[PDB]
Symmetry: D2
Subunit: 214 residues, 4 copies
Amino acid sequence: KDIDTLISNNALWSKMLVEEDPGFFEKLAQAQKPRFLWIGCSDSRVPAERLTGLEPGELFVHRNVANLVIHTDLNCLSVVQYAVDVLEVEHIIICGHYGCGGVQAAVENPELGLINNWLLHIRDIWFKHSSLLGEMPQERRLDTLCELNVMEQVYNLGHSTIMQSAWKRGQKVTIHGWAYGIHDGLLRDLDVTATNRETLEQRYRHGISNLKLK
Amino acid sequence: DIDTLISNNALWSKMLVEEDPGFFEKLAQAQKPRFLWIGCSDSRVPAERLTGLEPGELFVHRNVANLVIHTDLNCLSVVQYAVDVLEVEHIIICGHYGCGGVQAAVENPELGLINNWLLHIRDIWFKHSSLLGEMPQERRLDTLCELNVMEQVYNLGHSTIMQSAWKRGQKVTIHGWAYGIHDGLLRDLDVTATNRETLEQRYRHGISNLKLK
Amino acid sequence: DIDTLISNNALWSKMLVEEDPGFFEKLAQAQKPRFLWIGCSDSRVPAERLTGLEPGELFVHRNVANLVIHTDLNCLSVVQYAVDVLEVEHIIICGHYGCGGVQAAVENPELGLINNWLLHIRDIWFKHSSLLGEMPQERRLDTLCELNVMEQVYNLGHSTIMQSAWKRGQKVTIHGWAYGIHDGLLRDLDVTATNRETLEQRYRHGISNLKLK
Amino acid sequence: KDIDTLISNNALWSKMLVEEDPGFFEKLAQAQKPRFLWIGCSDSRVPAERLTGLEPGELFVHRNVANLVIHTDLNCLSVVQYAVDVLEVEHIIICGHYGCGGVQAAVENPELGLINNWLLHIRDIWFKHSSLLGEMPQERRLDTLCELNVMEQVYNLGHSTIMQSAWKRGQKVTIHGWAYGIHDGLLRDLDVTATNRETLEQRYRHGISNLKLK
Ligand SMILES: [Zn+2]
Ligand SMILES: [Zn+2]
Ligand SMILES: [Zn+2]
Ligand SMILES: [Zn+2]
């Protein structure tokens, strides 16, 4: 496709719904705040809406290379703060995916340019868990790192002043760490689910151990 | 709730695997996206559905109010990776009328940390105060939404990432669009640039023509 | 070279310990800085020497061209810590004429990554194009240096950190200064603000008076 | 002192040099590029110029809370890139100091607000070396972390695309990790000195081991 093609597809697409199912735009026209914040990868192999079967506007979304939650990235932190303190989302999902180009670039470490800086946050994880990854079959390491990464980001998110404050105020917010593959688009729960400053630390330590023992 | 999502995903997967056991094979066939879509976290209408693109055809970045801040490494990293590594041919910055981020910037309510990010939009509101001034107070937010996309397109074109990509002769086109929720119809703000010179020319006329419509 | 530095440090330390064995005790007496100095990495003349302040009396931040970007967490963290934790009474943003960062922004040479950071200064150059235009092309860089400090002061005052500090009644004053290398004499750009309202008023008159001098 | 006091001190200070030693401003008037980039802490207990006995303008400087070099902080990365690629500094010094309020806030972890996000990068180090720090007398841990921090930043700096590129191009640049105390203002070399992509990795591993064995 080319630009004129997308514009044509939209023109036709819109013309239908506006005559066929006008109700579609009526539902969107409703000021219904999203209940979920989806933090995923720019690769966007399978759109979050399609993966979860959710209607348009039910998901507040943020995407960056390799779905990271860097302690000091004000882009993601701002998305999170608006979602939590203003939209008051009930759930936050950090979703990674096996085969992610970002994660792979972090390991193979080619000289890609500017992006390698952002990817060093993933290499820190690669090293941090060098014992767990080394005690594994080579062709399983990238998929494992992919899970470790999501788990580390969930942890980072829980430690952010935004979440600590939300939880201290007693606000009900739950963060999840998910992952999926393009061979079945089936979501796998990495069970690092946190609902407060306590369950966050335990579920994290437990999430990691599981992989370390299984 | 959450449980529902995992269920929808389970069924959806099963259903597709049965109806089209190739659907996922198609995705498996590693296909590099040809487009980079920079939109708002509000994501009122998925980019895939607006453009009629299938999964994987779009590399995507979303932040509040679809900004391209000169010094935001998050967005810049997505752009550099898409341009230098994926070699996308097109970059689309798309805004949407009624955007909460845009409205929050004008009304200026005390929302917390997010207000710092929104100050970049307030800069635009004040930058175009005359143009917006001589205009019905009602149409101002929608115009600011358009001005914002146009300004972010301008920023994107001025980034060292785009300036060096164009300098080495790489073919990359950046676009500025916007759509409304009442019809989901995309509007080309006409600031499409293929190099440094047209970026300047399109921005100039882009703003100038608004002061005519 | 490096070796020289360690030697100078060795001797300097010895010499002080012998002349004033209390000098270091003085520093030891944990004293919270009352001022935050935001200057340029060029650091032509140390802040301590310009102001006649002794070590530890200044909490400091330096970046290229002394910017306070709305969304730069580096500078914002230094500001929040100094304001909410150290409780500094004054914040000074100081620029200097002949600044390489400021000049690089106007001349626009291809310097690499740093050009993205400098785009914030180019925004200011274009923002005040009329004022700078009706002016000798020779005095433009120096004026841009002043405009830049004034704009960064404005940004600092609009940050949620300063807005919430002032809202809770905390006493914090922000200043905008500049000095030249030919005399190291500080010039108050007169954009001193103690709250939200005066920040706006001082900025307005600050720019307006320049269009008079 | 108050604002009017600083302005007065400057007025008097300037009036002297301009009549006493006009040569001072003549030397500055010379377009002599700095040969060193100093990355230190905002605390600035003892000014870098005074610590090294260097004249004004001989040091390009950057300061942030706890002298960090975050993989993705474009503020510091931009200072570094300008210094290395434009000024062509020969040496880069990351200097920490014992007693640093930032490092201490990272450990004690009080609820300071926004700043705690930036400090999580130091807590990652605290945990990373939990074995080395735990096998130590409590009242020695903060000073140790202070060194570990500087060492980790030097490492981060060496891994940045800016340094990797400079070294690949064959440009001569050396990065050092220093530290000092306010009891004597004496600079201590943490010997993690890197001059290329090779010495960087070894000196790092060695720098850490030393503390781990001594
Ligand atoms: Zn990915
Ligand atoms: Zn929006
Ligand atoms: Zn400067
Ligand atoms: Zn410190």
